[PDB]
Ligand binder design. Structure first.
Ligand SMILES: [Cl-]
Ligand SMILES: [Cl-]
Ligand SMILES: [Cs+]
Ligand SMILES: [Cs+]
Ligand SMILES: [Cs+]
Ligand SMILES: [Cs+]
Ligand SMILES: [Cs+]
Length: 112
């Protein structure tokens, strides 16, 4: 009792499109940021979103035409809120990949 545990499995990396480009959606090793990087995934991420600034996560329902996760960010101190949609594109595993990254995130987000 009172033991606190953190996640210790491999961080999921998901084949996803963002603004119609293909790339990889993952978290940083410290599990503090959601990141998306365009293929070939040599470079830095195009999207880097602090878990601390995510205010919502939504999904297309299972059996939808597309598998999509939608992240809403805290409005920046520069003034509707920023949103990011990632379409899961693995031919067979799209929904399982979305579930996995969703399940990780919602665990990290609820713990804070
Ligand atoms: Cl589905
Ligand atoms: Cl599957
Ligand atoms: Cs994977
Ligand atoms: Cs928060
Ligand atoms: Cs689908
Ligand atoms: Cs966006
Ligand atoms: Cs793909």
């Amino acid at each position: 009792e009172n033991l606190y545990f953190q996640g210790a499995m491999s961080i999921p990396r998901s084949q996803t499109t963002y603004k119609k480009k293909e790339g990889i959606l993952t978290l940083t090793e410290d599990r503090k940021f959601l990141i998306w990087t365009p293929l070939p995934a040599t470079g830095p991420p195009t999207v880097s979103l602090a878990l601390d600034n995510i205010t919502n996560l939504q999904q297309t329902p299972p059996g939808s035409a597309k598998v999509i996760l939608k992240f809403t960010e805290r409005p920046r101190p520069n003034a509707p809120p920023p949103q990011y949609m990632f379409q899961f594109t693995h031919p067979t595993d799209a929904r399982a990949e979305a579930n996995a990254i969703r399940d990780l995130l919602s665990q990290l987000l609820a713990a804070a």
